[PDB]
Write an enzyme that holds these catalytic residues in place. Structure first.
Site, PDB file in Angstrom:
ATOM      1  N   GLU A  59     -41.646   8.820  23.007  1.00  0.00           N
ATOM      2  CA  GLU A  59     -40.871   7.583  23.056  1.00  0.00           C
ATOM      3  C   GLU A  59     -39.694   7.698  22.099  1.00  0.00           C
ATOM      4  OE1 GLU A  59     -42.865   3.708  22.231  1.00  0.00           O
ATOM      5  OE2 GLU A  59     -40.941   3.176  21.316  1.00  0.00           O
ATOM      6  N   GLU A 136     -42.254   5.107   9.695  1.00  0.00           N
ATOM      7  CA  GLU A 136     -42.714   3.948  10.450  1.00  0.00           C
ATOM      8  C   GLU A 136     -44.196   3.733  10.172  1.00  0.00           C
ATOM      9  OE1 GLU A 136     -41.649   4.981  14.430  1.00  0.00           O
ATOM     10  OE2 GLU A 136     -39.673   4.022  14.335  1.00  0.00           O
TER      11      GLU A 136
END
Ligand SMILES: CCCCCCCC/C=C\CCCCCCCC(=O)OC[C@H](COP(=O)(O)OCCN)OC(=O)CCCCCCC/C=C\CCCCCCCC
Ligand code: HEM
Ligand code: HEM
Ligand SMILES: CCCCCCC[C@H]1C(=O)O[C@H](C)[C@H](NC(=O)c2cccc(NC=O)c2O)C(=O)O[C@@H](C)[C@@H]1OC(=O)[C@H](C)CC
Ligand SMILES: C/C=C(C)/C=C/C=C/[C@H](OC)[C@@H](C)[C@@H](OC)[C@@H](C)CCc1oc2c(O)c(OC)cc(OC)c2c(=O)c1C
Ligand SMILES: CCCCCCO[C@@H]1O[C@H](CO)[C@@H](O)[C@H](O)[C@H]1O
Ligand SMILES: CCCCCCO[C@@H]1O[C@H](CO)[C@@H](O)[C@H](O)[C@H]1O
Ligand SMILES: CCCCCCO[C@@H]1O[C@H](CO)[C@@H](O)[C@H](O)[C@H]1O
Lengths: 441, 365
Positions: A59, A136
């Site tokens: 992604e 993240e």
């Protein structure tokens, strides 16, 4: 018109399929804008411990350049036409979609086709994203809500692919190789596993021709030995408590095993969850809210917030609630919450179920507001049900629910069943599992 | 609830922590069987013994209620001694208030059981009442006056039995109240545990964990009580009390109820009246001194090998004293009893406190 005639006026979703297996679905409206995208039967449930996090890594690379549009070229093209490109990954589905002017549908479909089939995956880009993902992971660690939900899955589905997080463990992030990714891709990104969906001002025939033109090369074979199928995932009554008295508020998530996407029972369960509802300190209703849990919590200041949920997966799911509260309010919150599940199992009234039914009706329609929510419903529905369920059908299903159905369905999933419990923060007061289990009957 | 349900309890307490509840059960058992016995018992010296035989022979199930009461008293002491032993070994006595009330409870139960034993008016009844009350005659200048005041005359007689029934009837209820205070003080701190280390970082709800353990314990206590009542009701009793009281003759092999034998041996070991009575009193009251004699830097004996050896030496010594208390005052028992008596006080007052200091130095603190 009545709510009934309005239901029968929604354009029917048109579905076609290419030779390679790719399904093409659309709902036409007269909007001068649209949303078109690709939904894929791929997610961490399909990953093993070795490549868990592969899908999420992809992604990160999906919009970083294709063989036809290297580097930021894809980016510049999307931006210059004022379009928006987004994506998301869950444990079972992955989606890449574009919001654009209806007149730009051809270029939108080309770009999606290009993204899904010709992603560069440049070694240097892979190294950059590696650091982005690690950062993240650190940020996600600060989101108590995301942590508690990952913990719920880890314990409820322990020992199965559903126990895995979407992002994967940090060591996998540090070690995943291009080989691993190209491998993941060749295996999962096949036409039979994808749905090209679109909603807005466009015609199915145009979308279909654009699909034939841009997606025909997509493989629709794979073979036989490499056709990633899903095994059922065992649910385990259990508890995971991460005590951290340094955090100001405790987060608790509790759930029993749900039926899974395809089951008719989900409608009654949604009605029941609507009865209990949701709440947070900014709600204006307070002491007058209809949900007993909501008004008790508001008048007695038992929590900052709470939300019931029905998370569905192929053949299983998590049915329950999540709440955020002060360290001295956990037992009370759990007491009132479980008492409400028991009241629904044994004494749901016709009037509260009607309210629940009306809440569900409003949620269903207000959710399908705009080309993006509609496009997502088309994509996901085709992957899960294999068809778009029309509003008129949803109404029929909701209409069939009454107090008797709510007591029976709730009794089936909640009554005397072992829950999965996840707690994070100042949880010294989170009830012992035996006490929670006894609360289930 | 604030005596059960959500009460936080250590996750690691063992079965030695079951005796507190067993003691509560013994007390309720005694009060219930006792009340039913009181519904048929008469305290006149001419009818006391007969009323007891009447209970056992003609009252429906009177025999089981009577023997449950008698053996219940024995179970009460077995539990008391295990409870106190647990406290000593694990350093539970550092909960000073709870412990001192505990000492009062032990003394009150002893007094209660003594008076109860007097009620059937058998030979042991009469001489026990004679000897125990006379312990007060050891008090200078007023001792004798106090004894006669308690007797209500110049000897144990009618007035004595009637007031003993009254005292025996009410004291158990006072014990119940005192026990509730014992528990209120304990709740302020919560329970101690085998490691002697604070368990605040690992507490579990009393219910269901210890409510179920307590029930299991209750069942085992009942099994032990009924094995005695249904298969060996006289095993722990004295045959001499089956003979009516005779004020002109003390049985030649008279001896105390088994749970009083160790104290009897200590008193018998001292050939001085005041000395023996003081030793007797100190043998129990020394419990109130234990907290002041604690030298170890650690609360429990779990991690103290030397203290452990001395602890078991103290238990073996009490067993020795119990055995001696049941033998005649003849050689070699006289000397063994004197050595055992001295060792009892030597262990508590000198050896254990010293071992604590030695252990401290070995750990460099
Ligand atoms: C009053 C006089 C009455 C007559 C005395 C008769 C005494 C008969 C002896 C019965 C004792 C049987 C019990 C033996 C238990 C054996 C055992 O397990 O010992 C080792 C074990 C190891 O435990 P930890 O150190 O915590 O570590 C755990 C590692 N996993 O130690 C224990 O269990 C300690 C428990 C001590 C309680 C025993 C009390 C016995 C009675 C004593 C009487 C009390 C004294 C004062 C009363 C007189 C006033
Ligand atoms: C009628 C008699 C008694 C009753 C009903 C009684 C009851 C209890 C109960 C219910 C507990 C908690 C459970 C347990 O730890 O066992 C307790 C704790 C305790 N009792 Fe007693 N007790 C009695 C006599 C005594 C005596 C004789 C002593 C000591 C001289 C004593 C000392 C203690 C102490 C120190 C504790 C704390 C134990 C720990 O947490 O380690 N008790 N008692
Ligand atoms: C701490 C509780 C108690 C203890 C330790 C206790 C102990 C005893 C003992 C040792 C006996 C002699 C048993 C025998 O060999 O015959 C006795 C007798 C008696 N007790 Fe209790 N008792 C208790 C409570 C009560 C209560 C509450 C009552 C009355 C309300 C009671 C009523 C009697 C009666 C009537 C007798 C005479 C009958 C008999 O000898 O069995 N007792 N008790
Ligand atoms: C109203 C409620 C009052 C209830 C009173 C009784 C009470 O508080 O019940 C509790 C369970 C208590 N037990 C404990 O505190 C306890 C604590 C730690 C471990 C265990 N067991 C294993 O680890 C316990 O059993 C226990 O056994 O006490 C009795 C002695 C009390 O009874 C009395 O004081 C009278 C005789 C009356
Ligand atoms: C009005 C109420 C009064 C006066 C109550 C006072 C109670 C005092 C104490 O309890 C607190 C006392 C019972 C307790 O002393 C610590 C015991 C261990 C005493 C032990 C004891 O028993 C004997 C016994 O039972 C006998 O039976 C046949 C005969 C006995 O010798 C012939 C004795 C005896 O020589 C001793 C020392
Ligand atoms: C609980 C009720 C289960 C069956 C509901 C079916 O409901 C029906 O579905 C059809 C196809 O989607 C619709 O065309 C029709 O209008 C609707 O009433
Ligand atoms: C549970 C095991 C307890 C020890 C059994 C022996 O018990 C003893 O038996 C003697 C003769 O019958 C009695 O005179 C004596 O009082 C009694 O304590
Ligand atoms: C536990 C140690 C056992 C005690 C041994 C007692 O031993 C005895 O002591 C008497 C004292 O006058 C002597 O007269 C007698 O001959 C001797 O055998």
């Amino acid at each position: 018109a009545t709510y009934a005639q309005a239901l029968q006026s929604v354009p029917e979703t048109q579905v076609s399929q290419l030779d390679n297996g790719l399904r093409v679905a659309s709902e036409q409206s007269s909007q001068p804008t649209c949303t078109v995208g690709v939904w894929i039967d791929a997610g961490s449930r399909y990953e093993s411990e070795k490549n868990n996090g592969a899908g999420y890594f992809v992604e990160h690379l999906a919009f970083k350049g294709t063989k036809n549009r290297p580097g930021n070229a894809l980016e510049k093209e999307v931006e210059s036409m004022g379009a928006h490109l987004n994506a998301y990954s869950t444990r079972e589905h992955t989606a890449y979609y574009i919001k654009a002017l209806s007149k730009d549908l051809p270029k939108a479909v080309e770009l999606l086709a290009d993204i899904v089939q010709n992603c560069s995956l440049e070694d240097s880009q892979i190294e950059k994203e590696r650091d982005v993902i690690l950062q993240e992971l650190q940020e996600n660690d600060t989101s108590m809500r995301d942590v508690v939900f990952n913990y719920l899955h880890a314990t409820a589905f322990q020992g199965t692919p559903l126990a895995q997080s979407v992002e994967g463990p940090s060591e996998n992030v540090r070690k995943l190789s291009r080989a691993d990714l190209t491998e993941y891709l060749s295996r999962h990104y096949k036409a039979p596993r994808m749905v090209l969906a679109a909603a807005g001002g466009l015609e199915h025939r145009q979308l279909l021709d654009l699909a034939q033109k841009h997606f025909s090369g997509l493989s629709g074979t794979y073979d036989e030995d490499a056709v990633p199928t899903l095994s059922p995932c065992r649910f385990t009554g259990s508890q995971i408590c991460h005590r951290e008295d340094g955090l100001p508020l405790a987060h608790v998530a509790i759930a029993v095993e749900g039926p899974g996407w395809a089951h008719p029972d989900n409608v009654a369960l949604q009605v029941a969850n609507a009865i209990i509802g949701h709440y947070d300190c900014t709600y204006g209703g307070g002491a007058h809210l209809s949900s007993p849990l909501a008004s008790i919590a508001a008048t007695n200041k038992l929590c900052q917030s709470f939300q019931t949920f029905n998370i569905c997966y192929a053949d299983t799911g998590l049915l329950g609630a999540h709440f955020v509260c002060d360290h001295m309010s956990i037992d009370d919150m759990m007491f009132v919450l479980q008492g409400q599940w028991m009241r629904l199992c044994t004494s749901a009234t016709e009037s509260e179920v009607l309210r629940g039914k009306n809440l569900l009706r409003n949620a269903l329609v207000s959710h399908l507001d705009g080309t993006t929510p509609v496009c997502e419903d088309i994509g996901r529905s085709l992957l899960t049900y294999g068809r778009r369920i029309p509003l008129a059908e949803w109404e029929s299903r909701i209409a069939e629910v009454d107090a008797r159905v709510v007591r029976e369905v709730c009794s089936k999933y909640f009554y005397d069943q072992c829950p999965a419990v996840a707690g994070f923060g100042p949880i010294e007061q989170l009830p012992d599992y035996n006490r929670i289990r006894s609360g289930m009957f | 609830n604030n005596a059960f349900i959500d009460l936080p309890a250590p996750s690691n307490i063992s079965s030695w922590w079951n005796f507190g509840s067993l003691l509560g059960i013994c007390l309720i058992l005694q009060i219930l069987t006792g009340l039913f016995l009181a519904m048929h018992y008469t305290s006149d010296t001419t009818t006391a013994f007969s009323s007891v035989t009447h209970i056992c022979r003609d009252v429906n199930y009177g025999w089981i209620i009577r023997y449950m009461h008698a053996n219940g008293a024995s179970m009460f002491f077995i539990c008391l001694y295990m409870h106190v032993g647990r406290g000593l070994y694990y350093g539970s006595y550092t909960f000073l208030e709870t412990w001192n009330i505990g000492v009062i409870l032990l003394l009150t139960v002893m007094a209660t059981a003594f008076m109860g034993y007097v009620l059937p008016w058998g030979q042991m009844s009469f001489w026990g009442a004679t000897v125990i009350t006379n312990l007060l005659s050891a008090i200078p200048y007023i001792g004798t006056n106090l004894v006669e005041w308690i007797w209500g005359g110049f000897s144990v007689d009618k007035a004595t039995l009637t007031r003993f029934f009254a005292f025996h009837f009410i004291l158990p209820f006072i014990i119940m109240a005192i026990a509730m205070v014992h528990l209120l003080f304990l709740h302020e701190t919560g329970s101690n545990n085998p490691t002697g280390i604070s368990s605040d970082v690992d507490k579990i709800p009393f219910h269901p964990y210890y409510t179920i353990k307590d029930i299991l314990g209750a069942l085992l206590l009942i099994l032990a009580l009924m094995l005695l009542v249904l298969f060996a009701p006289d095993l722990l009793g004295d045959p001499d009390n089956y003979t009516p009281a005779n004020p002109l003759n003390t049985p030649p092999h008279i001896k105390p109820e088994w749970y009083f034998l160790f104290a009897y041996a200590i008193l018998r070991s001292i050939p001085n009246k005041l000395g023996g009575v003081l030793a007797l009193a100190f043998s129990i009251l020394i419990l109130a001194l234990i907290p002041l004699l604690h030298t170890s830097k650690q609360r429990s004996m779990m991690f103290r090998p030397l203290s452990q050896c001395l602890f078991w030496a103290l238990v073996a010594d009490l067993l020795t004293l119990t055995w001696i208390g049941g033998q005649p005052v003849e050689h070699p028992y006289i000397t063994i009893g004197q050595l055992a008596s001295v060792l009892y006080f030597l262990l508590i007052l000198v050896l254990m406190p010293t071992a604590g200091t030695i252990e401290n130095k070995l750990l460099k603190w």
